Amino acid sequence: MTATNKQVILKDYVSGFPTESDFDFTTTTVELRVPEGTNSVLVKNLYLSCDPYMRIRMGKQAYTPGQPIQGYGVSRIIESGHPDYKKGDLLWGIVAWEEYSVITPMTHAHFKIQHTDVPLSYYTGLLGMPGMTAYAGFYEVCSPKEGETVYVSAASGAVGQLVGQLAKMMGCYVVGSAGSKEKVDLLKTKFGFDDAFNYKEESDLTAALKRCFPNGIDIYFENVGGKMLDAVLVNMNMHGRIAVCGMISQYNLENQEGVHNLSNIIYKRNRIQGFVVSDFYDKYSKFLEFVLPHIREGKITYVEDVADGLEKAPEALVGLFHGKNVGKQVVVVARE
Amino acid sequence: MTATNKQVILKDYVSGFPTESDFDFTTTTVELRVPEGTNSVLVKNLYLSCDPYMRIRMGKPDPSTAALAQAYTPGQPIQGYGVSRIIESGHPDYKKGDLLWGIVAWEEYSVITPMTHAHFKIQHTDVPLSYYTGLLGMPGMTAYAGFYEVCSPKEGETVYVSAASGAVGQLVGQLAKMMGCYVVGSAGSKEKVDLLKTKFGFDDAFNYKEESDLTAALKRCFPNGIDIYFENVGGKMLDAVLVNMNMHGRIAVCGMISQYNLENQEGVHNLSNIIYKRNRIQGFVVSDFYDKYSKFLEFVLPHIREGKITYVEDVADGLEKAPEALVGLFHGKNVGKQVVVVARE
Numbered sequence: 001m002t003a004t005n006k007q008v009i010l011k012d013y014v015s016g017f018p019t020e021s022d023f024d025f026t027t028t029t030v031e032l033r034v035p036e037g038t039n040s041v042l043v044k045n046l047y048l049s050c051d052p053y054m055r056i057r058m059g060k061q062a063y064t065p066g067q068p069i070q071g072y073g074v075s076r077i078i079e080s081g082h083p084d085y086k087k088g089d090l091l092w093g094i095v096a097w098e099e100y101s102v103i104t105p106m107t108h109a110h111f112k113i114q115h116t117d118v119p120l121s122y123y124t125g126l127l128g129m130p131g132m133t134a135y136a137g138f139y140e141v142c143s144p145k146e147g148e149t150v151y152v153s154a155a156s157g158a159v160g161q162l163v164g165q166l167a168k169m170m171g172c173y174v175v176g177s178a179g180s181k182e183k184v185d186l187l188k189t190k191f192g193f194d195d196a197f198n199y200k201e202e203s204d205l206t207a208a209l210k211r212c213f214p215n216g217i218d219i220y221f222e223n224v225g226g227k228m229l230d231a232v233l234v235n236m237n238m239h240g241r242i243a244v245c246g247m248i249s250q251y252n253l254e255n256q257e258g259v260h261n262l263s264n265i266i267y268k269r270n271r272i273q274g275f276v277v278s279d280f281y282d283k284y285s286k287f288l289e290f291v292l293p294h295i296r297e298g299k300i301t302y303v304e305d306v307a308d309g310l311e312k313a314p315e316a317l318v319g320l321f322h323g324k325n326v327g328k329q330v331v332v333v334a335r336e
Numbered sequence: 337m338t339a340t341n342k343q344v345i346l347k348d349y350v351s352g353f354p355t356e357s358d359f360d361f362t363t364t365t366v367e368l369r370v371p372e373g374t375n376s377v378l379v380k381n382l383y384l385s386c387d388p389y390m391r392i393r394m395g396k397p398d399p400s401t402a403a404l405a406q407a408y409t410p411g412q413p414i415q416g417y418g419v420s421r422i423i424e425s426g427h428p429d430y431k432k433g434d435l436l437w438g439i440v441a442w443e444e445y446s447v448i449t450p451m452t453h454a455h456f457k458i459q460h461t462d463v464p465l466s467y468y469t470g471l472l473g474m475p476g477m478t479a480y481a482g483f484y485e486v487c488s489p490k491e492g493e494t495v496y497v498s499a500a501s502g503a504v505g506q507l508v509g510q511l512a513k514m515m516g517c518y519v520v521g522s523a524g525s526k527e528k529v530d531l532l533k534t535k536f537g538f539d540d541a542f543n544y545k546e547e548s549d550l551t552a553a554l555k556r557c558f559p560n561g562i563d564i565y566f567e568n569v570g571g572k573m574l575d576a577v578l579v580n581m582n583m584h585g586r587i588a589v590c591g592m593i594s595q596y597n598l599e600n601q602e603g604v605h606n607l608s609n610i611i612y613k614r615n616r617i618q619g620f621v622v623s624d625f626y627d628k629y630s631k632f633l634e635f636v637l638p639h640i641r642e643g644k645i646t647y648v649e650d651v652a653d654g655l656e657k658a659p660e661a662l663v664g665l666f667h668g669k670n671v672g673k674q675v676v677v678v679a680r681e
């Protein structure tokens with residue numbers, strides 16, 4: 001290996017939706033040496049994650065045009081130059097969209113994989129940054145108690161599916177919405193939710209919510225926004241929490257959708273708390289040692305829509321925003 | 337034993353703003369005697385209060401609003417907060433010379449059954465009895481409970497409060513100042529902003545109505561963004577604040593009178609920002625904390641009596657005015673706590 005290196009780049013700033021045309025392919029050639037830098041390691045990017053924050057990251061902390069779009073991925077140390085990383089092991093964290101990248105590890109972008117008795121695809125979704133985010137947001141920011149109704153929202157996907165699974169381990173009554181009957185079956189089937197509805201087979205969303213929850217929503221895990229939020233507010237419960245994890249139904253408009261119903265948080269006494277996963281990474285290694293018994297035991301599960309190659313990685317990032325993605329969108333770039 | 341007790345009533349459920357018309361008057365004759373059943377007391381309503389909550393209790397009954405809540409049964413009188421003197425026995429902790437505050441009807445001679453976070457006995461007289469409908473009562477309990485146990489302020493923090501010339505936003509700004517915060521306020525009247533700037537304390541304030549790009553103004557007052565936000569307003573305000581906010585910014589949602597007399601509630605766009613800069617919106621209801629009311633007095637009653645807490649009012653006589661009075665809040669014709677004297681003392 002003193003190879004060529006393929007990279008998926010960004011042309012220029014996406015207005016509205018992202019499309020395959022706002023991404024271009026290019027070949028650099030990499031020397032597999034130590035290499036040149038300071039606390040650097042060279043790596044072979046194994047897997048990539050299709051992260052929805054990326055849209056916000058590609059409009060005019062924003063990736064520079066002409067340079068590969070950066071994003072989370074799990075990788076293997078080719079050559080080292082960093083104390084912690086032996087010249088042959090597994091990492092995850094921010095990396096370029098390439099086969100061969102050079103990143104100098106830092107404690108909260110880059111973690112080090114010390115459990116391989118589980119897929120190295122999980123560490124871009126379940127045992128990776130969506131997992132910390134489902135752990136963090138549902139445990140701290142929602143502050144769940146037992147027996148109480150949890151509405152989850154892009155539930156099939158990356159963050160959504162551990163929340164209803166964590167919540168059902170508590171023993172709540174969980175419901176979840178998803179866009180198609182493939183995903184809405186996955187929910188009650190695979191992760192045994194207590195109900196699940198296809199929000200795209202509905203006009204009556206407030207009434208949809210009001211039907212799925214007889215006695216109202218104590219907790220709502222927010223992964224989407226707008227219309228959905230507004231029905232959830234009518235539906236919310238007294239002293240019930242809403243942890244705002246994100247708003248996919250907003251990242252893409254060049255005109256942000258307007259919410260009405262906030263007036264309800266007075267009467268119903270709603271905490272609405274918008275977190276960020278980063279802040280909880282000191283609790284990462286506690287999450288890991290908590291879930292890792294449940295996965296390899298058949299208690300926590302996952303579902304990941306796995307593309308193959310950087311070639312099929314624009315057709316993949318774009319797929320999140322409409323909903324091609326069935327579960328976590330990962331991108332296999334090196335099979336091992 | 338009859339005594340002719342006048343009243344004020346609601347014709348019908350309101351849609352939009354109240355007007356003097358949605359209320360009718362009428363009279364009756366209460367027989368002045370010892371009330372029975374539960375632990376009941378016949379009272380004599382000296383004062384009464386115009387608080388903007390009464391509009392969500394005037395509208396047609398939604399479950400959403402039924403959590404505050406359940407509208408006034410159209411035809412019998414209006415229920416509200418007022419000061420009252422015990423005209424008869426009925427109960428243990430209430431002697432017939434006595435004087436409570438709480439929820440009475442809009443009538444001359446109410447009868448009440450005094451519940452623990454309903455009816456509160458006045459003990460202290462050295463202060464105007466009209467203070468038990470502002471500062472020493474419920475709207476006073478809001479600014480205390482909403483800013484200490486809800487905005488979780490830290491000394492030095494930037495603060496913005498709105499509807500800053502009314503029973504809550506003028507005592508908030510002072511509890512704010514009492515810990516070196518940078519309270520700025522807002523109000524619509526050209527002179528109302530002058531009570532904020534001078535009389536109440538605020539470091540700056542503005543006239544939102546003389547102000548056109550709302551957010552430009554909050555960008556001026558706080559060049560270093562807004563840590564806390566007390567809100568008695570909503571809509572177009574909350575979107576300027578959410579832009580201007582700081583990280584780990586907090587918001588206490590007391591009320592949103594703007595939205596209240598809208599049939600067609602305004603759209604709050606900018607709510608997405610809170611995912612970036614870990615903002616917390618929290619809606620509370622003062623009613624929940626009336627345990628920390630003994631404690632609140634204990635606090636305020638020293639600070640007022642010493643020049644640390646200033647409080648303007650707006651008085652007006654009898655029920656005849658209490659329509660025009662209650663309808664004046666929504667248009668901002670109350671230059672402080674709007675009180676109505678049924679019968680002075």
Ligand SMILES: NC(=O)c1ccc[n+]([C@@H]2O[C@H](COP(=O)([O-])OP(=O)(O)OC[C@H]3O[C@@H](n4cnc5c(N)ncnc54)[C@H](OP(=O)(O)O)[C@@H]3O)[C@@H](O)[C@H]2O)c1
Pocket residue numbers: 050051052053054129130133137153154155156157158159160161177178179180183223224244245246247248249275276277278320321322323325327328329
């Ligand atoms: N809190 C944090 O710090 C944190 C961390 C990471 C990511 N996030 C954010 O939250 C999301 C990521 O994970 P994920 O669990 O949502 O799954 P994902 O599968 O990774 O992302 C795509 C999903 O978006 C949904 N979707 C797209 N447009 C939608 C719309 N207009 N309305 C409703 N649903 C829509 C689709 O579900 P349907 O087919 O069912 O409609 C699809 O499954 C992103 O918005 C991301 O920016 C937050």
Ligand SMILES: NC(=O)c1ccc[n+]([C@@H]2O[C@H](COP(=O)([O-])OP(=O)(O)OC[C@H]3O[C@@H](n4cnc5c(N)ncnc54)[C@H](OP(=O)(O)O)[C@@H]3O)[C@@H](O)[C@H]2O)c1
Pocket residue numbers: 266387388389390474475478499500501502503504505522523524525528544568569589590591592593594620621622623665666667668669670671672673674
């Ligand atoms: N438990 C709770 O959550 C709780 C408890 C008590 C009260 N509240 C609520 O919060 C408010 C407190 O009452 P208060 O006695 O302190 O007096 P207040 O809010 O000052 O009421 C009158 C004021 O409303 C302002 N106003 C009128 N229309 C407005 C509009 N469209 N936009 C912005 N401001 C407008 C006027 O001034 P400017 O034009 O000068 O701005 C006027 O000074 C009420 O809405 C009440 O229902 C909530």
